[PDB]
């Protein structure tokens, strides 16, 4: 498990969705 | 205007939902 | 096996269409 | 730090992709 | 101004072109 | 083989550079 620091709630939510997306693709 | 994006496969449907949500957060 | 994603606005519709095609190309590598 | 978050990421591949994507996002937002 | 991005593999080239299409639309 | 993608704008050049790296990471 890794931890990516994200400043800003906007980019946090988007990066969450992008992570979930990468998982779906894999 | 409301559009409907055709998508083949459950996997990509779910991804595009997340990408659509991400666009809306940016806009 | 076919799904439909409602999208508000032609601009996002067009963006998502290209993003879908990117996904499909990546998945075919 | 009230608006600073830590995204929990399973596996090193996705972690490194997400760092690139994060930087991409920040570039688009400037 | 015009830039050139080095890409290895024609498949990845086509993927990046599609991603570039997306990026330009998002920026309008 | 090596190709060169033409990109208008420094912004998209740097982004697409990051996207290329991401592609290569997924393909490893």
């Amino acid at each position: 498990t890794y931890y990516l620091q994200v400043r800003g709630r906007e980019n946090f939510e988007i990066l969450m969705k992008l992570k979930e997306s990468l998982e779906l693709m894999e």
Side-chain angles (χ1 to χ4, degrees), chain A residues 1-6 8-26:
Chain A
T1 300
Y2 290 71
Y3 292 90
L4 176 66
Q5 183 182 254
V6 189
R9 55 114 217 126
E10 180 192 321
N11 287 343
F12 184 62
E13 287 189 49
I14 294 169
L15 286 166
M16 191 181 315
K17 291 171 179 306
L18 295 175
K19 180 190 67 166
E20 292 158 3
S21 293
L22 285 169
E23 285 168 0
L24 284 168
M25 157 160 24
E26 299 158 345

